[PDB]
Amino acid sequence: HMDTSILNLRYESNHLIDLSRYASKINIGSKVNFDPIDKNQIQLFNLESSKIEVILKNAIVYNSMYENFSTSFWIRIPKYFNSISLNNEYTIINCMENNSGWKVSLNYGEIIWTLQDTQEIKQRVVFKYSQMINISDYINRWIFVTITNNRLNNSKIYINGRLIDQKPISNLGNIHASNNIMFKLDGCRDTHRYIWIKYFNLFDKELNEKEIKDLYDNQSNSGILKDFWGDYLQYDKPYYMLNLYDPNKYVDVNNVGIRGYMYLKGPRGSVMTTNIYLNSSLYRGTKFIIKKYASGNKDNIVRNNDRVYINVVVKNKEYRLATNASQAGVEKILSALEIPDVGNLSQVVVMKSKNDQGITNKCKMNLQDNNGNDIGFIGFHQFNNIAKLVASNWYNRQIERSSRTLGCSWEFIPVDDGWGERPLQ
């Protein structure tokens, strides 16, 4: 019954603007980069001119002993690669003046919130993520940050709608924040560092748990499927495949044609920089390309419920993922077929977004016959110790979001500069 956002930065009507009633003024530097496909995604480099300043209407400048307030935004932070990034806290969102106010800063594996009163009393709340981990929910993936502040008790940091850390701030006095907000890498020693950011909001209350969940859901664009990094999933774009039940395996073929089969094999192998990161290799196996079938939309964005074809790239040539549904048993083994030779075989796939408590960006792929009847979600099944890819209605008959739909949960991984791995070929 009341929108509590007092700043809402959004790309609309050809400009990045504040949608709130305050219409705070925005100044964009010459070295700010925008995503051509998703116009709201903003890239800030470690350069002077790569910045955005917001001039706040005076009535919303924070100068108080008592007022509760919150902030939210989405961020995508490239993997830290070099020891130059160790022990180097750098500001990214600045509303400090004369050593009072608030800021968001980053450090190796950290997102930090700092409040400081006019007597120089400080409090920090921190989200810490490891870079020594097989598959990270956080490294180089879009994350939803929310920070809330109750002047009588705690400051809280949430990540993807989940509470991470809370610390008391009731000892802080008057906090006199800056007249402007500066989005800019300030004090970062790594010359190659950047961030992606979108949807920055300020709120004039402490947001509650539900409000934060709703904000997360709404801002996530659930009508559009996402790749592994959290960007829009696209047609005609090569992707490496991740199966969430077996994250240490990758997709391979051996032989194309109807006597061949797709399968999962492991382990993936590792990428490493000693003391800096140790992760599973992501660029392994045969790449998949999503192809337009039924969609009436002209763009290359894959939408929830889009019926598509899936192509497999083998030796730089495209083949069609298909199966003969007539085969005995509920599990229908998938093959990589010459596109002209697919005939009446089952090949149409319905793309669907999943969302739950686990990792973000999950996709399901429901194979259908040519009459539109379900063959089943694409997962895998053991045949003589070989984990062959299959379409199976066994998945569709399982309880939703429960652990038995893990095997048919996939993510699509394109090569990305914030990951830094070199493909083997």
Q: Which residue has the tokens 């016959």?
A: 369
Distance CA 94, CA 80 (A): 22
Is 421 annotated among the ligand-binding residues?
no
Distance CA 318, CA 285 (A): 14
Distance CA 236, CA 6 (A): 40
Q: H helices within 153-241, ranges in order?
A: 209-219
Q: What angle do CA 27, 33, 36 make, to 5 degrees?
A: 120
Distance CA 298, CA 345 (A): 27
Distance CA 349, CA 336 (A): 14
| CB 90 within 8 Å of CB 107 | yes
| CB 157 within 8 Å of CB 113 | yes
Is 245 annotated among the ligand-binding residues?
yes
| CB 178 within 8 Å of CB 103 | no
| CB 411 within 8 Å of CB 363 | yes
Distance CA 289, CA 25 (A): 42
Q: Kindly provide the b/e burial profile for residues 139-159, where b requires at least 16 CB atoms within 10 angstroms of the residue's own CB.
A: bbbbbbbbbbbbbeebbbbbb
What are the binding residues?
245, 331
Residue ranges for the binding site for a ganglioside GT1b (d18:1(4E))?
245, 331
